[PDB]
Structure 1
Amino acid sequence: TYQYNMNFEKLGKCIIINNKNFDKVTGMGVRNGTDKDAEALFKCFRSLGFDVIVYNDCSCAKMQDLLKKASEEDHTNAACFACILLSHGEENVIYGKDGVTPIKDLTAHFRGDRCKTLLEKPKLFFIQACRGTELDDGIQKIPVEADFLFAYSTVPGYYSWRSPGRGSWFVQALCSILEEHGKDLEIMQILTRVNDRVARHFESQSDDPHFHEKKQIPCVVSMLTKELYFS
C-alpha cells in the first residue's frame, strides 16, 4: 500500500551510458576506470532484474536520441526504468564525446505527460559526473515530475572522484551495497548507505596538496511517492 508495485513481467530497462573517450575539441582526458564501473554496474543491475544495455562513447545527439526512443517505447509490462550516466560533467550539464547537454533535457523525456507507460512508476537516474569545480576539504491527476529519483555522485558545485585502477568512488560503493543488500533494502536505505560509504571510506591521495586528502558526499534527489524494493 505504501510501496511501488513490482508485480510485472519485467523489472524494467536499464540504460548505461559509458563515456570514456572524448573528442579533442572538448579538451577532456580519457575517463580511465569507467569500464570497471560500467561492468560492475551491468552485473549489479542485471542481478537486480533489469534488462541492461550498455552504450559507449555517445554523442549528445546520441544520448538524446537514446533516451527519447526509450521514452517512446512500451513500458506497460515494466515495473520501473533506470538510466545511468558515466561521463565528464559540470553543473546541471553532462558531457557527450562531442560536447555538453543539459541533464534535465535527458530526463524530461520520461516526464508523466510524455511517457505515459511509465506513469505512476519510478524513474531512476544514476549520474556519476562532476557538478562544479569546488573541493571538499573535510574535517576530523498526478504531477509530471513525480516518481523521479536522481542519484548524483556528488553535491552540486563539487568534484566526483575516480580512481583509474579501481573506478569511481560512488559507483564502486553503490555496487558493493547492491551486491550485499540490493534486494532486501529500500532504495533510500541503499543510497543512504552509499552516502555513508563514499563519505567515510574514501580520502583522495595526490602529490599536489590541492588534491591531497579530499572528500566526497553523494546527493540524492527524491520525487518518489512510494517505497521502492527490487523484489
Structure 2
Amino acid sequence: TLKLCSPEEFTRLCREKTQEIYPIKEANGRTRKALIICNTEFKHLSLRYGANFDIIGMKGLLEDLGYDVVVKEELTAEGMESEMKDFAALSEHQTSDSTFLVLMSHGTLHGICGTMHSEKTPDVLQYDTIYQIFNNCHCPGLRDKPKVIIVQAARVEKDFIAFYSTTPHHLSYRDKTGGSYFITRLISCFRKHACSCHLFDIFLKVQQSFEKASQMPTIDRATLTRYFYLFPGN
C-alpha cells in the first residue's frame, strides 16, 4: 500500500521550499480529477489482454493519491479527442491542483490507436492534439498546474510531463495474473517513494528498476517549472 506523508513534513517542506514546488491544495474542499482512457478490443488489431489489470491498478493508485478517476474504454480517436475535451472543461479543475492522464492502447509512431485503427483505415489520435487540448489557452482550469501523462502504447505549453512505454503488448506482461511491467513498477515506486520524492525522481526510480530487471520507458515533453511533490495523505 501507499505509505503516507506526515503533516509535519508536508508543512515543513511547504514553508521551507515554497519557491521550488508546485502549490498543493489541502484535501478539504479539493476535487482532484484524473482520466484513464484504455482500449482493449480492436476491430482489426489484436486484443490487449491483461489491460484490465492496468486499469484497476492505476485507478487504485490515483485514488490513493486523492484523484477522482474518470474511466473511458473502447474509444475511437475521435472519441478520445471528444472525451479529452470534455474532461479538460471540468469545473472541478479550478478547485484542483493537478491532474493525471493515463493512455493505454496500441500505438503508432506519433500517436495512439483507436478501436477502429488499421493501416488501410487509420484511427489515430496524435500526441500533439493531447497537449493542445490541455494547454493554457484551451484548458483554463489547469493553468500553471502539473499535467502528468502516462502513456502505454504498444508498438503555449507548460507544466507538462509524459512517461512513455511502447513495449510490444505480448512482451509487456510477466504472467496472466498481473498487469504490465511498466504499470506494476510504476505503481510500486509510487507506493514506496511518493511520500518523499517529487514526481521526476519517481519516474527516474522506475527507469532504474528497468535496468536491474527490453527497452525502457522514456520521460518526454517535460515542461515542469517546479518540483511536483504529491504529499500523499494530505
The TM-score normalised by the length of structure 2 is 0.80
Shift in Å at residue 182 of structure 1? 2.3
In the alignment, the residues of structure 2 paired with residue 71 and residue 193 of structure 1 have an alpha-carbon distance, to the nearest angstrom, of: 30
Higher relative contact order (CA 8 A, sep 6+): 2
Give the alignment partner of residue 125 of structure 2, picking from 101, 109, 113: 101
Higher strand share: 1
1:145 to 141, 157, 175: 157
Per-residue deviation, 1:29: 0.6
Per the alignment, residue 35 of structure 1 pairs with: 52
Is 1:50 the equivalent of 2:92?
no
SS of the residue 1:172 aligns to: helix
Shift of 1:11: 5.9
Looking at structure 2, the residues matched to 11 and 125 of structure 1 have their Cα atoms a distance apart, in angstroms, of 19
Secondary structure, counterpart of 1:79 in structure 2? coil
Unaligned runs of 5+ in 2: 1-18, 118-123
Return closer, same or farther for 1:125/1:105 CA change in 2, 3 Å cut-off. same
Is the 2:22–2:229 Cα contact (8 Å) retained in structure 1? Answer: yes
1:179 pairs, out of 191, 199, 208, with 191
Query: Which of 87, 103, 109 is the matching residue for 1:91?
Result: 109
What is the CA-CA distance between 1:43 and the residue it aligns to? 0.7
Residue type of the alignment partner of 1:22: F
- Distance (Å, rounded) in 1 between the aligned partners of 2:187 and 2:52: 13
In structure 2, what residue type is equivalent to 1:153?
S
Q: How many Å separate the matches in 1 of 2:104 and 2:20?
A: 32
Aligned length: 200
Native 8 Å contact 2:100 2:147 kept in 1:
yes
Q: Which residue of 2 aligns with 1:14?
A: 34
Specify the SS of the correspondent of 2:98.
Answer: strand
173-182 or 163-172, larger mean C-alpha shift: 163-172
C-alpha contact 1:79 1:121 (8 A) present in aligned 2 = yes
Alignment partner, residue 199 of structure 1: 211
AA matched with 2:224 = L
SS at match of 1:167: coil
1:83 and 1:125 in contact (8 A); partners too: yes
Q: Match for 2:190: what amino acid? A: L
Q: List per-residue Cα deviations over 1:181-201 (Å, max 9, x = no partner).
A: 223210011000111112322
Give, in whole Å, the separation in 2 of the partners of 1:106 and 1:185. 27
8 A Cα contact 1:11 1:80, kept in partner: no
The separation in 2 between residues aligned to 1:197 and 1:129, in whole angstroms, is: 20
Deviations 1:88-145 (A, max 9, x none): 0011110110222212112310111111121111111000013x5xxxxxxxxxxx21
Structure 1 unmatched ranges of 5 or more: 133-143, 202-214
- Alignment of 1:170 with 2:182, yes or no, is yes
Task: Measure the CA separation in 1 of the matches of 2:33 and 2:195.
Answer: 17
Secondary structure at 2:97's aligned position in 1? Answer: strand
